Amino acid sequence: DAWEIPRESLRLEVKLGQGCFGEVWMGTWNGTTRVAIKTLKPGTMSPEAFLQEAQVMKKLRHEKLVQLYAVVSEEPIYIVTEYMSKGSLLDFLKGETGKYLRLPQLVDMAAQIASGMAYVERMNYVHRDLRAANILVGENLVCKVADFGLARLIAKFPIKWTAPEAALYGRFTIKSDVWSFGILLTELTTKGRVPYPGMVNREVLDQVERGYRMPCPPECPESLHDLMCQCWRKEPEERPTFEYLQAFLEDYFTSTEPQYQPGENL
Ligand SMILES: *CCC(=O)Nc1ccccc1Nc1nc(Nc2ccc(N3CCN(C)CC3)cc2)ncc1C(=O)Nc1c(C)cccc1Cl
């Protein structure tokens, strides 16, 4: 309906891997436009709930969110979006290009993510699965938010990324996305290391409820660590908005750290 395209117009060329809720390919639409195609494996806990992500992606349109191109609603179900040339941000940070990424690039990538989540904030949506694994990198270090299957109006809650009030009581708000953003900032500043090193899930929930927070990563400024701790307030109402986070991260090297100097890793 309005978005559906003939199956013959697509050509699945190179397989990219098993992405979020489905198998992702690098294809070509109408022999002219390079695209990305997610396929549903039949029977795997999804009839048209696989199409629930494309249902949300039709309403949410923003330059920092992966844009929906088309959809094939007859099995096998295809979801066609734009192609992000660099892949997952987590793989990008762990990968070859991650070595040379310094704080200026990593803060800008975060500002792009805060800008995308600021649009989600204005649209009264909640992401519920914000992390480096669900953010795609394109050309010129363009970062875009992905995985809108759990997105709703106002991989189930990994404890290390989810706000404790959302993991425990199901209170998923935009402030629980700000908590996840603070965790993502540790992924950026640590070249994509898993948060809370050496701790299992139930140990993270007990420690975080006792007030434990991850310390300042090495070579990370205290000002950026303070922004993480604000994203990790126990009370969600006192956690910053994404409009503030975006404006903060864009002006970071003028208004916050004008005497920044590059180090070994950051
Ligand atoms: C949750 C987002 C997701 O699934 N990300 C992901 C992870 C692994 C493979 C594919 C995708 N999705 C995806 N990728 C790309 N582009 C892309 C993927 C992988 C690479 N590689 C380079 C590094 N090396 C390790 C091999 C892998 C390069 C580029 N573009 C789009 C998407 C994507 O998920 N698009 C999308 C579709 C098709 C449907 C619905 C939503 C989205 Cl975001």
Side-chain angles (χ1 to χ4, degrees):
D1 296 327
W3 293 79
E4 68 181 326
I5 59 165
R7 172 179 269 92
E8 306 181 7
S9 56
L10 300 168
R11 287 294 198 94
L12 280 70
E13 292 198 347
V14 175
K15 174 179 172 178
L16 299 170
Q18 300 150 345
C20 45
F21 303 104
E23 191 181 26
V24 188
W25 287 71
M26 187 272 290
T28 307
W29 187 19
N30 301 332
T32 51
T33 60
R34 164 169 289 167
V35 292
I37 304 172
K38 177 191 293 186
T39 70
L40 163 63
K41 191 164 185 297
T44 62
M45 295 277 287
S46 293
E48 294 232 355
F50 172 85
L51 216 50
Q52 201 78 16
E53 183 186 30
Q55 233 168 322
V56 180
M57 292 181 61
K58 288 166 183 173
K59 303 295 182 179
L60 299 185
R61 312 190 71 178
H62 188 260
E63 63 182 26
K64 297 305 178 180
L65 312 188
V66 181
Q67 178 58 225
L68 175 62
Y69 276 6
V71 125
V72 168
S73 40
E74 290 191 334
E75 315 181 30
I77 309 184
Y78 293 158
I79 292 183
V80 189
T81 67
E82 61 178 326
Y83 178 66
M84 308 304 301
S85 57
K86 298 303 178 179
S88 173
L89 170 61
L90 181 60
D91 291 350
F92 191 76
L93 295 168
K94 297 166 66 72
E96 204 155 313
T97 322
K99 293 184 177 181
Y100 309 101
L101 290 182
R102 295 292 91 100
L103 197 66
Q105 295 81 40
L106 295 171
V107 167
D108 178 74
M109 297 167 92
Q112 298 182 49
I113 297 160
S115 175
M117 293 305 298
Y119 170 84
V120 174
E121 194 176 61
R122 298 189 298 269
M123 292 295 156
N124 300 311
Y125 274 81
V126 185
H127 190 279
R128 292 196 282 171
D129 204 5
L130 182 61
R131 43 181 173 170
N134 289 327
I135 289 167
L136 299 174
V137 182
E139 304 165 30
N140 199 30
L141 276 193
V142 166
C143 288
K144 299 189 180 185
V145 182
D147 192 12
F148 296 101
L150 298 181
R152 286 191 184 182
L153 274 166
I154 297 182
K156 270 192 173 181
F157 65 111
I159 300 295
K160 301 180 182 182
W161 280 268
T162 311
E165 82 269 3
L168 289 172
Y169 315 131
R171 290 172 170 169
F172 284 92
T173 69
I174 197 66
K175 301 300 185 180
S176 60
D177 281 333
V178 178
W179 182 289
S180 307
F181 184 84
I183 307 293
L184 163 67
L185 289 180
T186 76
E187 293 180 294
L188 284 170
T189 52
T190 60
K191 305 304 190 308
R193 295 308 304 272
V194 169
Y196 307 99
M199 300 175 56
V200 285
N201 272 337
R202 194 147 211 89
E203 188 181 355
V204 174
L205 178 57
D206 297 328
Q207 282 287 77
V208 166
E209 284 298 328
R210 294 301 300 269
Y212 174 83
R213 300 297 188 267
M214 279 179 292
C216 185
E219 306 187 45
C220 181
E222 163 62 28
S223 63
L224 195 61
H225 171 72
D226 173 70
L227 197 74
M228 304 176 182
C229 294
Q230 294 181 349
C231 296
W232 302 334
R233 300 296 189 191
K234 172 166 185 169
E235 299 305 319
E237 56 179 7
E238 294 298 323
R239 311 208 271 253
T241 71
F242 286 113
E243 183 187 24
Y244 174 87
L245 291 168
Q246 169 179 1
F248 180 95
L249 296 169
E250 293 170 359
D251 305 358
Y252 183 78
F253 294 98
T254 300
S255 304
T256 310
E257 298 288 343
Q259 266 75 32
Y260 159 81
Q261 285 167 343
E264 175 186 351
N265 293 323
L266 289 183

Short mmCIF file of all heavy atoms in Angstrom, two decimals, residues 148-171:
data_model
loop_
_atom_site.label_atom_id
_atom_site.label_comp_id
_atom_site.label_asym_id
_atom_site.label_seq_id
_atom_site.Cartn_x
_atom_site.Cartn_y
_atom_site.Cartn_z
N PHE A 148 13.79 0.11 14.79
CA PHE A 148 12.57 0.72 15.31
C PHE A 148 11.46 -0.30 15.52
O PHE A 148 10.28 0.08 15.56
CB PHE A 148 12.10 1.83 14.38
CG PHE A 148 13.05 2.99 14.28
CD1 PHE A 148 13.90 3.11 13.19
CD2 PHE A 148 13.10 3.95 15.27
CE1 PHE A 148 14.77 4.18 13.09
CE2 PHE A 148 13.97 5.02 15.18
CZ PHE A 148 14.81 5.13 14.09
N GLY A 149 11.80 -1.58 15.66
CA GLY A 149 10.78 -2.59 15.88
C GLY A 149 10.09 -2.44 17.22
O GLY A 149 8.88 -2.68 17.34
N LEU A 150 10.84 -2.06 18.25
CA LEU A 150 10.29 -1.84 19.58
C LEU A 150 9.84 -0.40 19.81
O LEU A 150 9.45 -0.06 20.93
CB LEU A 150 11.31 -2.23 20.65
CG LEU A 150 11.75 -3.70 20.68
CD1 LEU A 150 12.75 -3.94 21.81
CD2 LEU A 150 10.55 -4.62 20.82
N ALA A 151 9.87 0.44 18.78
CA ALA A 151 9.49 1.84 18.93
C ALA A 151 7.98 1.97 19.01
O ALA A 151 7.25 1.39 18.20
CB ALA A 151 10.04 2.67 17.77
N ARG A 152 7.50 2.74 19.99
CA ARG A 152 6.08 2.96 20.19
C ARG A 152 5.85 4.39 20.66
O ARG A 152 6.76 5.08 21.12
CB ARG A 152 5.47 1.98 21.20
CG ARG A 152 5.30 0.56 20.70
CD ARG A 152 4.46 -0.25 21.67
NE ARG A 152 4.34 -1.65 21.27
CZ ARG A 152 3.63 -2.55 21.94
NH1 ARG A 152 2.97 -2.20 23.03
NH2 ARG A 152 3.57 -3.80 21.50
N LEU A 153 4.59 4.82 20.55
CA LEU A 153 4.17 6.13 21.03
C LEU A 153 3.88 6.08 22.53
O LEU A 153 3.86 5.02 23.16
CB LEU A 153 2.94 6.61 20.27
CG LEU A 153 3.17 7.36 18.96
CD1 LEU A 153 1.88 7.45 18.16
CD2 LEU A 153 3.72 8.74 19.24
N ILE A 154 3.64 7.26 23.10
CA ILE A 154 3.30 7.37 24.52
C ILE A 154 1.84 7.77 24.68
O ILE A 154 1.08 7.09 25.37
CB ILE A 154 4.22 8.38 25.23
CG1 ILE A 154 5.68 7.90 25.19
CG2 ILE A 154 3.77 8.59 26.67
CD1 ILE A 154 6.64 8.82 25.90
N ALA A 155 16.55 -9.91 22.32
CA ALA A 155 17.15 -8.61 22.60
C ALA A 155 16.19 -7.73 23.40
O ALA A 155 16.07 -6.53 23.13
CB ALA A 155 17.56 -7.92 21.31
N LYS A 156 15.52 -8.32 24.38
CA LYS A 156 14.59 -7.59 25.24
C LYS A 156 15.33 -7.09 26.48
O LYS A 156 15.91 -7.89 27.22
CB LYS A 156 13.40 -8.46 25.64
CG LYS A 156 12.23 -8.38 24.67
CD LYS A 156 10.99 -9.02 25.25
CE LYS A 156 9.78 -8.78 24.36
NZ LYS A 156 8.54 -9.38 24.94
N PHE A 157 15.27 -5.78 26.70
CA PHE A 157 16.00 -4.99 27.70
C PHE A 157 17.28 -5.66 28.17
O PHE A 157 17.31 -6.32 29.22
CB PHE A 157 15.08 -4.62 28.88
CG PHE A 157 14.60 -5.80 29.71
CD1 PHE A 157 15.05 -5.97 31.01
CD2 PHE A 157 13.66 -6.69 29.22
CE1 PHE A 157 14.62 -7.03 31.79
CE2 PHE A 157 13.22 -7.75 29.99
CZ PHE A 157 13.70 -7.92 31.28
N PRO A 158 18.37 -5.54 27.41
CA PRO A 158 19.68 -5.91 27.96
C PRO A 158 20.02 -5.01 29.13
O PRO A 158 20.04 -3.78 29.01
CB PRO A 158 20.64 -5.71 26.77
CG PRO A 158 19.91 -4.79 25.85
CD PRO A 158 18.46 -5.10 26.01
N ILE A 159 20.28 -5.63 30.29
CA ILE A 159 20.39 -4.89 31.55
C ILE A 159 21.45 -3.80 31.46
O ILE A 159 21.26 -2.69 31.97
CB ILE A 159 20.68 -5.87 32.71
CG1 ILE A 159 19.56 -6.90 32.83
CG2 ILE A 159 20.85 -5.11 34.01
CD1 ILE A 159 18.22 -6.31 33.21
N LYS A 160 22.57 -4.09 30.79
CA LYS A 160 23.68 -3.15 30.78
C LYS A 160 23.36 -1.86 30.03
O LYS A 160 24.01 -0.84 30.28
CB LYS A 160 24.92 -3.82 30.17
CG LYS A 160 25.36 -5.07 30.91
CD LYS A 160 26.58 -5.70 30.28
CE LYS A 160 26.98 -6.98 31.00
NZ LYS A 160 28.21 -7.60 30.42
N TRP A 161 22.39 -1.88 29.11
CA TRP A 161 22.01 -0.69 28.36
C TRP A 161 20.70 -0.07 28.80
O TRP A 161 20.47 1.11 28.51
CB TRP A 161 21.92 -1.02 26.86
CG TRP A 161 23.24 -1.05 26.15
CD1 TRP A 161 23.85 -0.01 25.50
CD2 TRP A 161 24.11 -2.18 26.00
NE1 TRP A 161 25.04 -0.43 24.96
CE2 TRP A 161 25.22 -1.75 25.25
CE3 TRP A 161 24.05 -3.51 26.42
CZ2 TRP A 161 26.27 -2.61 24.93
CZ3 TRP A 161 25.09 -4.36 26.10
CH2 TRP A 161 26.19 -3.91 25.36
N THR A 162 19.84 -0.82 29.48
CA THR A 162 18.49 -0.36 29.80
C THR A 162 18.46 0.34 31.16
O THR A 162 19.15 -0.07 32.09
CB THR A 162 17.51 -1.54 29.80
OG1 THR A 162 17.70 -2.30 28.60
CG2 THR A 162 16.07 -1.05 29.85
N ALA A 163 17.65 1.39 31.25
CA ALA A 163 17.44 2.07 32.52
C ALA A 163 16.84 1.09 33.53
O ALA A 163 15.96 0.30 33.17
CB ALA A 163 16.53 3.28 32.35
N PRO A 164 17.28 1.12 34.79
CA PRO A 164 16.79 0.13 35.76
C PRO A 164 15.29 0.17 35.98
O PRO A 164 14.67 -0.88 36.18
CB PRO A 164 17.56 0.48 37.04
CG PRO A 164 17.97 1.90 36.86
CD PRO A 164 18.22 2.07 35.40
N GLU A 165 14.67 1.36 35.94
CA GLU A 165 13.22 1.43 36.09
C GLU A 165 12.49 0.81 34.91
O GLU A 165 11.34 0.38 35.07
CB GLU A 165 12.77 2.88 36.29
CG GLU A 165 12.63 3.71 35.02
CD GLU A 165 13.90 4.44 34.63
OE1 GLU A 165 14.93 4.27 35.33
OE2 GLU A 165 13.87 5.19 33.63
N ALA A 166 13.12 0.76 33.74
CA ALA A 166 12.51 0.10 32.59
C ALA A 166 12.73 -1.40 32.62
O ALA A 166 11.84 -2.17 32.24
CB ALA A 166 13.06 0.69 31.29
N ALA A 167 13.91 -1.84 33.08
CA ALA A 167 14.17 -3.27 33.17
C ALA A 167 13.33 -3.92 34.26
O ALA A 167 12.83 -5.03 34.09
CB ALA A 167 15.66 -3.51 33.44
N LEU A 168 13.14 -3.22 35.39
CA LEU A 168 12.45 -3.81 36.53
C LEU A 168 10.93 -3.70 36.38
O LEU A 168 10.22 -4.70 36.53
CB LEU A 168 12.91 -3.14 37.82
CG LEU A 168 14.33 -3.46 38.27
CD1 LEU A 168 14.75 -2.59 39.44
CD2 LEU A 168 14.43 -4.93 38.63
N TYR A 169 10.43 -2.50 36.10
CA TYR A 169 9.01 -2.22 36.17
C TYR A 169 8.37 -1.98 34.81
O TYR A 169 7.16 -1.72 34.75
CB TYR A 169 8.76 -1.01 37.08
CG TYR A 169 9.57 -1.06 38.36
CD1 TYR A 169 10.30 0.04 38.79
CD2 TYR A 169 9.60 -2.21 39.14
CE1 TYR A 169 11.04 0.00 39.95
CE2 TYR A 169 10.34 -2.26 40.31
CZ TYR A 169 11.06 -1.15 40.71
OH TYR A 169 11.80 -1.20 41.87
N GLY A 170 9.13 -2.08 33.72
CA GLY A 170 8.59 -1.84 32.40
C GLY A 170 8.36 -0.39 32.06
O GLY A 170 7.66 -0.10 31.08
N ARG A 171 8.91 0.55 32.84
CA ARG A 171 8.73 1.98 32.60
C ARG A 171 9.70 2.43 31.50
O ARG A 171 10.79 2.93 31.76
CB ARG A 171 8.94 2.76 33.89
CG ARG A 171 7.85 2.55 34.92
CD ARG A 171 8.20 3.20 36.26
NE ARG A 171 7.06 3.21 37.17
CZ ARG A 171 7.13 3.52 38.46
NH1 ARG A 171 8.30 3.84 39.00
NH2 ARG A 171 6.04 3.50 39.21
#
